[PDB]
């Protein structure tokens, strides 16, 4: 999660994805926050690993883009639309895309195991 | 903290008079509060320690 260049359109912002890194009242406020942050990071990586994208900031996949998600061309998506606007546009089809990505990675793993006989 | 360019009025609902208008100053008035009486603190014992 790198805010900044967040009003920048997708084409300009994707380039600017960069180096990610480099009892008391306050006693439990720190611990609960730390546990929640750890659980959220491990869920983001849990999703990212199921698609074969573990350890990759920009991951390409073999899932064709259905037009039911959007019939907006590459230039229209990447030249005059920001990331928040895009994720609002495709906010209804995130679960379906997650399922398709998981199924595609499963198919790729099965095919890889088959080719190894 | 004091405002930057001018005095700012912040109320939850201006029309409602049960909502407290909050005024922010971009200039801070200085208040000097003093208790000029030499006082004596005498500590009595009301229990163990």
């Amino acid at each position, epitope marked *: 999660g790198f805010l900044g260049a967040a009003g920048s359109t997708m084409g300009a912002a994707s380039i600017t994805l960069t180096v990610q890194a480099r009892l008391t009242v306050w006693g439990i406020k720190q611990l609960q926050a730390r546990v929640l942050a750890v659980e959220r990071y491990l869920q983001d990586q849990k999703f990212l690993g199921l698609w074969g994208c573990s350890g990759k900031i920009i991951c390409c996949t073999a899932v064709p883009w259905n037009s039911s998600w959007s019939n907006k061309t590459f230039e229209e998506i990447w030249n005059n639309m920001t990331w*928040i*606007e895009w994720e*609002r*546009e495709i*906010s209804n089809y995130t679960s379906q895309i997650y399922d398709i990505l998981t199924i595609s990675q499963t198919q790729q793993e099965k095919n890889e195991k088959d080719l190894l006989e | 903290s004091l405002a930057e360019e001018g005095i700012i009025i912040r109320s*939850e*609902n*201006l*029309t409602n008079n049960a909502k407290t208008i909050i005024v922010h100053f971009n200039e801070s008035v200085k208040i000097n509060c003093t208790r000029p009486s030499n006082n004596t603190r005498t500590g009595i014992h009301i229990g163990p320690g």
Partner: nanobody
Framework: QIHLVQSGTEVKKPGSSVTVSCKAY?????????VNWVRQAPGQSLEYIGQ??????????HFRGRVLISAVDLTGSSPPISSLEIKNLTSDDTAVYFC??????????????????????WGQGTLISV
């Protein structure tokens, strides 16, 4: 909750200028809400006139130059007020004008996007005969 009331029924001679005023009871500010003006012809479908959104006013291409949208937010005496002025009235302007305010606070509500929004609250409507 939120209630919108408008000026009232008016009868105008063609060529005059009519002002419809919309007072929003329950809108904390027009910085967060957006006022959209809608006309409904007798029997016909609803049309879109113009809006003020984030204190910027615009009108549909059909109505550009023939309409003014103005608004002022909360004061001690009155709730936020939105005004619809139709310059150069013609016989085609006989419609029940409506006032709407939609909450544009959170971007993930779905009621709005890029300044084009669905209308959540509807005013009483002021029939204008000309």
């Amino acid at each position: 909750q939120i209630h919108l009331v408008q000026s009232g029924t008016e009868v105008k001679k063609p060529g005059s200028s009519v002002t419809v005023s919309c007072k929003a009871y329950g809108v904390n500010t027009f910085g967060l809400y957006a006022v959209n003006w809608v006309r409904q012809a007798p029997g016909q479908s609803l049309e879109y006139i113009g809006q003020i959104w984030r204190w910027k006013s615009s009108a549909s291409h059909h109505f550009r130059g023939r309409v003014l949208i103005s608004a002022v937010d909360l004061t001690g005496s009155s709730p936020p007020i939105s005004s619809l002025e139709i310059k150069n009235l013609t016989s085609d302007d006989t419609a029940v004008y409506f006032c709407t305010t939609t909450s544009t606070y959170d971007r993930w509500s779905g009621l709005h996007h890029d300044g084009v929004m669905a209308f959540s609250s509807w005013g009483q409507g002021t029939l204008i005969s000309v």
